[PDB]
Design a protein around this nucleic acid. Sequence first.
DNA 1: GACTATGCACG
DNA 2: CGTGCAT
DNA 3: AGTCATTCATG
DNA 4: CATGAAT
Lengths: 474, 474, 220, 218
Amino acid sequence: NIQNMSLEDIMGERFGRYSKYIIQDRALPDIRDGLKPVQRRILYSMNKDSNTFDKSYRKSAKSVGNIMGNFHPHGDSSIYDAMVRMSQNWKNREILVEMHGNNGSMDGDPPAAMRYTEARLSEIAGYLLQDIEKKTVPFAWNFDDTEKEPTVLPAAFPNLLVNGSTGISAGYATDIPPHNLAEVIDAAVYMIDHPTAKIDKLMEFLPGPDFPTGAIIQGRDEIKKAYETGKGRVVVRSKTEIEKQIVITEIPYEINKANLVKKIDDVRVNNKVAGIAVRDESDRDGLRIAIELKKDANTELVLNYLFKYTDLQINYNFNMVAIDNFTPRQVGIVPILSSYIAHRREVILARSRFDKEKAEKRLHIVEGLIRVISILDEVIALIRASENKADAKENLKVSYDFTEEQAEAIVTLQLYRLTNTDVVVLQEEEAELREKIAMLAAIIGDERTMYNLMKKELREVKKKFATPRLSSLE
Amino acid sequence: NIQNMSLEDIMGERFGRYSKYIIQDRALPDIRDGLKPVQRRILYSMNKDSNTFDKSYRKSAKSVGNIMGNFHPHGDSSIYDAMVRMSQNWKNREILVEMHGNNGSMDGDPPAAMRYTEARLSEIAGYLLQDIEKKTVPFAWNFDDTEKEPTVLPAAFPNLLVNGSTGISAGYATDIPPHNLAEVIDAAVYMIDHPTAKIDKLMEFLPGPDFPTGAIIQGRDEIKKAYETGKGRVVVRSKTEIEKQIVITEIPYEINKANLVKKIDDVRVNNKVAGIAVRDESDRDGLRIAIELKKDANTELVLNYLFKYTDLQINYNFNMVAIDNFTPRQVGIVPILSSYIAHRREVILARSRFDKEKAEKRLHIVEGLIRVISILDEVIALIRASENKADAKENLKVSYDFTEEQAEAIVTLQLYRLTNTDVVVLQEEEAELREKIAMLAAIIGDERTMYNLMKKELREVKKKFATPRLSSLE
Amino acid sequence: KLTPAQSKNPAKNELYLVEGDSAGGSAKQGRDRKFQAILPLRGKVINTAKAKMADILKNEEINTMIYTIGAGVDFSIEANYDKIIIMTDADTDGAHIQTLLLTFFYRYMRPLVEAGHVYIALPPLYKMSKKKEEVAYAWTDGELEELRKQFGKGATLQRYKGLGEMNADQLWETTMNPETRTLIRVTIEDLARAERRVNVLMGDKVEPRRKWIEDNVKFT
Amino acid sequence: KLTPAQSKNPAKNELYLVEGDSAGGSAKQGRDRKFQAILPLRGKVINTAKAKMADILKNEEINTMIYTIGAGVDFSIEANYDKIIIMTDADTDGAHIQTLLLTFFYRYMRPLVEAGHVYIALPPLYKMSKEEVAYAWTDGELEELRKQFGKGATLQRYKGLGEMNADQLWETTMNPETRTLIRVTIEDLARAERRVNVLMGDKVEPRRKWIEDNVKFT
DNA sequence: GACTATGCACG
DNA sequence: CGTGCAT
DNA sequence: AGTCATTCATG
DNA sequence: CATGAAT
Ligand SMILES: [Mg+2]
Ligand SMILES: [Mg+2]
């Protein structure tokens, strides 16, 4: 047996398969929850295993094993390395994982081996997962068909813009700068009300990136270009002070403090510029790089040179590419924001639909017990005169035409439950349910009532997690 | 602040700590279940996670992570490597782990990386764990104080002799050849009856090692020495056939088929002996090494040479050292067998004690419901006239002087349970319990009744897992 | 280091190229050592169409290949096997490596490919199972759905996320034993088309690759 | 490769010898870079009393030590630090490494040890919390800590140094103000030689006896 | 997708 | 040298 | 207790 | 030459 295939065609399929899997499944973030698969699987798994901010930490390696075993058929290092990135405040604006021990740093030192460290999900992360358990989101089978896995998260906040993301696949790469959770949500809410929103106005809310590493960002013009088109180049300058000596207390995002320092001193030794005279004195709680100068305090020339010749000033590039509709799009702020909004809509509606059914069920059951409490004597008498649990059930259905579930509920009632015969209490819950159901039915078919609830939850999230800007605009 | 210490004393403590931990906690097997800690923790963990012979396999790495996280604070490789050894039929006589995929082989090829493979506990392994859950064995806290871990296993069979063990610590090393599960248990049972047993008689039962790799074992005299003293040297010869050519179909335990083959052909090329004329033709299901000869069929001289000059015949050394009473002993068969027996005694007694309490509890409860079924009417009437579940309980205790647990049991009874008012059925269980309790109370204080039960279970285990000898004696 | 066949007979002896040592084990084990050799690579292979000459010949994995095959990069022929068989894990990362290995052969060892000596071996991804056992194999997603329909309830599904994850007997019975196996035979039916295609996908330019994706990758 | 201190001042500058890169990170991070250098080793160190000369000097980890310290193996002195501090994970495998590192210093760099320049740093194993927080260094300490915290307490065990944070490593075991160090001196020579050669020796037979007689397997 | 160095006892 | 748990 | 090769897009 | 997911 042999199938004969060409080189062109074989190369064709085999490439197409991979190129696709890479784009969707590996590198590129979903435009909805702004996560790559590994990220999502880590989050879901940790949370399912209730490994959460409020409870004790847990041996990273145990976490990694479970992810690998249940959801993610790949290297441990790929997984844990990714998990670790999510614990890095100089990398992410709003961290989704808290790790206790050594998880690297700005000097670039390598994260401690996984067998050493311990991890949990952060607080805001829970918000990414909020409502997951109330059928709010599409599930798929895992690779084994053994257990079910979310295809996207609920997403209480617009993670995509908040923590940015990068970014290397076949044919596509992505870079998305972090943003100020507060400011982002502002943009979101504004759009929720005025959908036909122009970028200029949105910019009043989201005025450009917010790097966790602080720093100065200059390039209003190109930032707009980025927000409209999806591509742009911006300038980022470390933040400088002069002491009577040059003090550095913020550096450009994605830049390596350690090497940055060597490269500067290399300037001195090569005496590539005048007054070069360089020390790093940084400790747990503050960044400090001291460039202390000699005689001819040509400092302005020296500083201006350093900006040009070293990575004290660099440019950051925007390549905002996410997966929308199962496909690679290069998108601006408007598509991201919009698509996030429309997502939250599906979420809210799906949630409420689930909540409503649950309400209606217990309601039908409560409606039931209320009837029973009136016939209790004769009801029990029947149950006793019955042969089997099942026969017991079948007799109530026949006689007092109760329903099926109503029957199981009456029958399985324990005994001390009879200690509480009181149609008032049940009636109290009955009101409660009826009011919830009617509230929900509104959201479901009330489009503006729906959008308002969105706006509220969003505002509530802003209040909880909002923080001052770290990066400045020039 | 500074504490001033000498070199002698510091070196003293620091060595003593390590030497000890290594001996007890790492290298040396417990004389009772014949396991090293890693082994035990693997077994317990897998089983607790119900990863068992009867159910589907599970991603080794998930298994490894859990062991590391809960019980075993060390390298994954150390753990998984150990787990893999336990899956190796050419290494262990009776395998305690079944692994699906590549777990190495006789050619010595390295086991597939853990992310690739899948594993479960074998069937006989369950027997090592049998009764674990009925307080049969001393527990300790894990390193974190989060969960409790067995300090030894129950041990339905004498694993120590069966799967042997080795064996490198500070001051001590161990080598213990595998044995024939059937023959071992014979020895055990005989000793159970005739404790003052001499080695000569025991030898009639356990006549020396049984290697999973088959082979020929010659050295009756030194085997006795080993069984008495704990140290001995034995000769092991590969099993040979002549075809009309030398055919090899069994090789010496712990020997490397691959290199063994090279070393033979090296004899030919170096023409170190006469008729050297060597091919390995082995496939999944059978070992075959062909040494096909030239003209002067000095074959006997050639074979006799090969035995001397290569590892076709080697000697195996006995260094039987286990941990008894928290300490290193070099022990013979008699101590091993005895100490195993005495263990099983504690197990059986502890088990029965647990079983008895459980019996007595439900019995007290059954005794209770039987009373109630007579007063059912008035009882329910009381419960209804009661305010709280708790008040409900307190009223029965006051009025019908029921007990505390009896009360919870009556009160929590669901409703369809009233469908079954029938003192006959309860009385049936009541008999059952009383008969079990009285049986147990016997074992507990009946020493021979206890030993008999041991003998039975042991025989039952022999019947289930027994297999023909693989290794032959000359 | 390689695991060679007993007989050295360039007429009927196959060289099985594998994605790593772990898979290598599985291969070596389930296999007819009379005429089957096994050569491990260390993961993803150098893009021979994106790097120069020195960068290439200097890389261990390509060099080892060149040696164990004979002919050489120029080329020349009959050494050394009448089949060079690319056997990668069943997933998509496997398909990438196939893509890379093929371009290397296509670029340098061209006569080899034109000749009809380069094969792709097609090992299972999924195995589904329901003394009485029913067992089927799938090779990609779609196949899985149909298999699932067949087995209906009860079935367990196993996915070989890497070759070292299936056993010896399995690898043999399914994908190596010539009696019951099936192989893909790679031939080039233009030259111009091949060059055209390889250079876009495997090329260095990106801009065209991207377009080729957009236009042809069906992200349904 | 090492992480050296800002000032090069052999009068007050310490060299912290660590069990690996993962721990190295924790060290480098929580630390006063003015006078604290950090030098990682790749796990268990060569038994310098069981191997020859060439085997030894040829091993990377010993050689790197010799270089970064100055003096040399003969020896000579004042380079390069007025403290060489052995800081190993808190468990027992740490204690083994301490044993190995000490014999190397004792065997070759003897003047160093006789001088009073070799230190052992004593980082926590267990931390218990109820916030009320205590630290334990070995088993026994744990029991007493457990009694104190009674119910509710969570216990954490640093199974390796890279498992505690920066602030922690500093506050507990590196900051001279609140830290405590062990200072290793030799108070015979003959006794030291005698002892080292048994434990660390090559002979086994004596070591074993030393174990039986003195290792309390309670 | 793989690899390397160390301790420890023993023949 | 290699063996089996460890760093 | 560590380490190394390779893909992929972009400046 | 990183960068961050992968073999
Ligand atoms: Mg693969
Ligand atoms: Mg350690």
